[PDB]
Structure 1
Amino acid sequence: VPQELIEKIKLISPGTELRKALDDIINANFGALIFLVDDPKKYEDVIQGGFWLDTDFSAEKLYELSKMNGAIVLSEDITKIYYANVHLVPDPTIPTGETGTRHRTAERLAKQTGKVVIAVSRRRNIISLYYKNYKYVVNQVDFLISKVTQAISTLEKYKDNFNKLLSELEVLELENRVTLADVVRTLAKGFELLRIVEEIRPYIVELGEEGRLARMQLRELTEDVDDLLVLLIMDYSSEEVEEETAQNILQDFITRREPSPISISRVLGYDVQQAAQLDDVLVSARGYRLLKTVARIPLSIGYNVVRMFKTLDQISKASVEDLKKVEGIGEKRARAISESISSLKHRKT
């Protein structure tokens, strides 16, 4: 979905005076056919009849005008009403797959001029936006709230399962009993969860000002999940991996690749092709997750800690003095590392 078109969709998103007018028009079963231009003179050959207005835009004015037959011409910045009650005459030879004169005119006119045209028919409650060779149908808020509320409820269930997987993983991590199956299962659930977020994003955007609570909910449910998955990938990949690399593996499984167990464990660098194999592959966390998240050790410095001790298990055996040899670890960070791991072992295992 081009960014060019997304800028146009903003024009009619909940919160704008234009959208407010269009909601009133839909509510009254008036139709609408609206043409957005910056220089009316340049387009005087596709504009016939009607009334020259040249007056400041308002929602109420647009509403009143739409009671009349034909079309309305506004400035692109939606600050002026230029014409009302006009006949729009785009080139009839331009292909269109729309139905009815109103929507066939709209799509032809947008194709012909490279401008936005908005059509509302009298009996439906959708707003059809046309820009160049684009068509975007904009939905009512109540339809969008419904899908988004469902998506959020779905995200809650994925997130709860993710937390359960993770808390079990933690236990296994601290006891050094993790298998590849355990990692992959946890990553998959994380990947799927953020996929759902990506898929609902267009709905969220369409909601405009009415999507504010929805965005807050997404943010709260997904807050640290991306960082968490990146750290897991750095901790459990077959060979050592830089952060931005792990970030890309996340990007890949969120958007382009399917998060099947074999696919994940393969891209983590393991050579398995049967799902049952994962249970037999023993893995040991590098320790990045615990270092950044719990001991609050910056990644740049955690590299050196992993450089020296290789795995979490060995880090958990190091004394404060042992840790202090690392490039970046003073007594502050050394006790942070030492005490936070041991605290965790005590309470969790």
Structure 2
Amino acid sequence: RPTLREAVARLAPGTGLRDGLERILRGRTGALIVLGHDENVEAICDGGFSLDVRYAATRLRELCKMDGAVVLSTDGSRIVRANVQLVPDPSIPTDESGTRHRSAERAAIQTGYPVISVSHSMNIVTVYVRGERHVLTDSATILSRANQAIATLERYKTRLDEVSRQLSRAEIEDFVTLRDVMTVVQRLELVRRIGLVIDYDVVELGTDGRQLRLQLDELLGGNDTARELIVRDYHANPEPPSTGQINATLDELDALSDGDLLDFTALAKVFGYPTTTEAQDSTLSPRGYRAMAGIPRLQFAHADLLVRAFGTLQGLLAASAGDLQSVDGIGAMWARHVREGLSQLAEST
């Protein structure tokens, strides 16, 4: 049966239902709509008219001009009853206010289908699904909230870029420390989490969120790959981390609380380094995945072969073109390409 998130989706902008509800709000009639009909719904239905017509936004609006409730079919394709009096079991507990809304939630609990109440006085839509409630929000308000989050995401993306460049400078110089790696890990997670918040707003916006989706995907583009690469470079396991190991590490990062993200030792635990403050100053050596990703045109398949062969970024910098053409799967052309691409990083920083 419909879940709370699924029901909100059925009422998202661009849907036939949401069009009808918008019409009801402008009409200021109020409404009480049951999204489903079975034996249990009929049990609580009293009086009213039985009708069999196709759903239409306009048809719903007119029917809700009448006292009572409108029942739709489970698939949502039809309007099955109108002018109904709901009589849910009064023992079902609810903290809502007034006959309409208390009747709505009780009916939602008893039948198991979503129930919608529209307040004529407040012009507010509430949907009740099995003890949970959600109040719809105008697309403008959601956009305002999401654009504030987009602004913060713009600030976190700039901050991530600068610390990442600092880490890249340290990797070339061979003066990286756990603290340097974990500063980037934190900034990667902050970008990810604020991105998840904006994503929920995109879902709630429905068709009104299409542009916000494009902007969000552009800003978040490459964040997943950066999280993978940093795990691949600085994971306490001696051998290069396994693919499942990488997925395990990222899952632990998501499991961290927001407060834990502000703890560099909490992040160090996830990567497998000691949790002591002293451990933050210990020197690390990158494997070279991040640097290789910065080389233009270099497919990750080839970089994985080189990183496993030489072990460390410093080994790759010291390697000759002939040293980089002795790895199976690395041709002469790619050995030259990586050789000049690495020596360009050495000079630049």
Q: TM-score, with normalisation over the residues of structure 1?
A: 0.91
2:113 aligned with 1:112: no
Give the whole-Å Cα distance in 1 for the aligned partners of 2:123 and 2:323.
Answer: 69
**Does structure 2 retain, via aligned residues, the 8 Å contact 1:191–1:250?**
no
Q: How far apart in 2 are the matches of 1:235 and 1:261?
A: 17
1:196 — aligned with what? 194
Residue 234 of structure 1: how far off its partner (Å): 1.2
SS at match of 1:130: strand
CA drift of 1:262 comes to 1.1
Q: Partner of 1:144: helix, strand, or coil?
A: helix
Q: Which residue number in structure 1 is paired with residue 29 of structure 2?
A: 30
Code of the residue aligned with 2:252 in structure 1: it is D
Does the 8 A contact of 2:157 with 2:191 survive in 1? Answer: yes
Matches within 5 A, 1:180-191: 180-191=178-189
Per-residue deviation, 1:165: 0.9
**Which position in structure 2 is the counterpart of 1:284?**
285
TM-superposition CA deviations, 1:239-298 (whole Å, max 9, x none): 232233223322322343422211112322222422x652x3212210112224525555
Shift of 1:138: 2.1
CA drift at 1:177: 2.0
**For residues 86 and 160 of structure 1, do their structure 2 counterparts lie closer, same or farther at Cα, with a shift above 3 Å needed?**
same
The aligned residue for residue 327 of structure 1 is 328
- Counterpart CA distance in 1 for 2:124 and 2:224 is 36
What residue number does 2:243 align with?
243
The answer to whether structure 1 residue 264 and structure 2 residue 267 are counterparts is yes
In structure 2, distance between residues paired with 1:178 and 1:296: 26
Residue matched to 2:88: 90
Q: Which residue among 69, 82, 94 is the counterpart of 1:71?
A: 69
1:336 alignment counterpart? 337
Segments of 5+ residues of structure 1 without an aligned counterpart are: none
Shift of 1:155: 0.5
Matched with 1:177 is: 175
Asked whether the 8 Å contact 1:126–1:140 carries over to 2, the reply is: no
Report the Cα distance in structure 1 between the residues aligned to 2:56 and 2:274, rounded to whole angstroms: 64
Number of equivalences: 344
Q: In the alignment, is the contact (CA less than 8 A) between 2:31 and 2:118 conserved in 1? A: yes
8 Å Cα contact 1:37-1:74 kept in structure 2: yes
Aligned-partner Cα distance in 1 for 2:46–2:267: 61
RMSD: 2.1
- Where does structure 1 differ by over 6 angstroms across 4 or more consecutive aligned residues? none
Q: Note the C-alpha offset of 1:143.
A: 1.6
Distance in 2 (CA, whole Å) between partners of 1:214 and 1:114 is 34
Larger CA deviation: 85-94 vs 336-345 = 336-345
**1:3 Cα deviation (Å)?**
8.3
1:135 is aligned to 2:139: no
Does the 8 A contact of 1:144 with 1:207 survive in 2? yes
Secondary structure of the residue that 1:96 maps to in structure 2? coil
- Consecutive unaligned residues in structure 2, runs of 5 or more: none
Contact 1:301 1:327 in 2 (8 A): no
Task: Letter of the 1:31 partner, please give it.
Answer: G
Q: Deviations over 1:134-170 (max 9, x none)?
A: 3222222122111111111110011111111112222
Distance 1:32 1:256 in 2: 43
Contact 2:48 2:83 in 1 (8 A): yes
State which of 35, 50, 53 in structure 2 corresponds to 1:52: 50
Structure 2 length-normalised TM: 0.91
Q: Go from structure 1 to structure 2 and tell me whether the alpha carbon gap of 1:132 and 1:177 turns closer, same or farther (over 3 Å shift).
A: same
Fraction of identical pairs, as percent: 38
Measured after TM superposition, the shift of residue 83 of structure 1 is 1.6
Change (3 A) 1:229 1:296: farther
